[PDB]
Copies of this chain bind each other. A is one copy, B any other.
Amino acid sequence: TTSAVNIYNISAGASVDLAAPVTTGDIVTFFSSALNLSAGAGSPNNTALNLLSENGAYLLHIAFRLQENVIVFNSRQPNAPWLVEQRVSNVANQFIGSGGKAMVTVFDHGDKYQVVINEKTVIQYTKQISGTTSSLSYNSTEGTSIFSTVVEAVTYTGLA
């Protein structure tokens, strides 16, 4: 009944600490002012957006792989191996209806993470690890990212 809006500018390769943690019922949107579907190969990821716990855990890892023409969703505890990785085929098909810019939205449904690309829901990822998101990262493969060098992030917390 007293929500909050937080805006962050995330440079590729950076990680920002949220001034307000993202928990169940809260939202996180990533804004890209560019879209490059014919950028190049990722090592292996061209672009990755991560929601991380205060322990360094990867609550949610989102990776776009142009050469493998896929999107990967996974998670993992700090200094531990990668877990069960879901995947969505065909990158470009999710960005249909873009036009030089993209929006990725993550809904934290407590026990799941709903990921939306613009207006299209791509997956209802089931949380392999639980907790509140206290920081986010935007990692890219040198010069072959599908998003702008700077990605804006708006978080809507205090909902439920």
Contact status A5-B119, CB under 8 Å: yes
Question: Hey, which chain B residues are within 8 Å of A29, CB to CB?
Answer: 5, 154
Question: Hey, which chain B residues are within 8 Å of A109, CB to CB?
Answer: 1, 3
How many copies of this chain does one complex carry? 2
From known contacts A154-B103, A156-B156, A160-B160, infer whether A116 and B27 are also in contact, taking CB-CB under 8 Å: no
Complex CA distance for A6 and B159, rounded to whole angstroms? 18
Contact status B4-A119, CB under 8 Å: yes
Is A107 part of the contact surface with B, judged by Cβ < 8 Å? yes
Q: A residues near B, CB below 8 A?
A: 1-7, 25, 27, 29, 103, 105, 107, 109, 112, 114, 116, 118-119, 121, 124, 154, 156, 159-160
Pull 27 A–B residue pairs with CB atoms less than 8 Å apart, ordered by A.
A1-B109, A2-B114, A2-B124, A3-B107, A3-B109, A3-B114, A3-B116, A4-B116, A4-B119, A4-B121, A5-B29, A5-B103, A5-B105, A5-B116, A5-B118, A5-B119, A6-B119, A7-B118, A7-B119, A27-B27, A27-B156, A29-B154, A105-B156, A156-B156, A159-B159, A159-B160, A160-B160
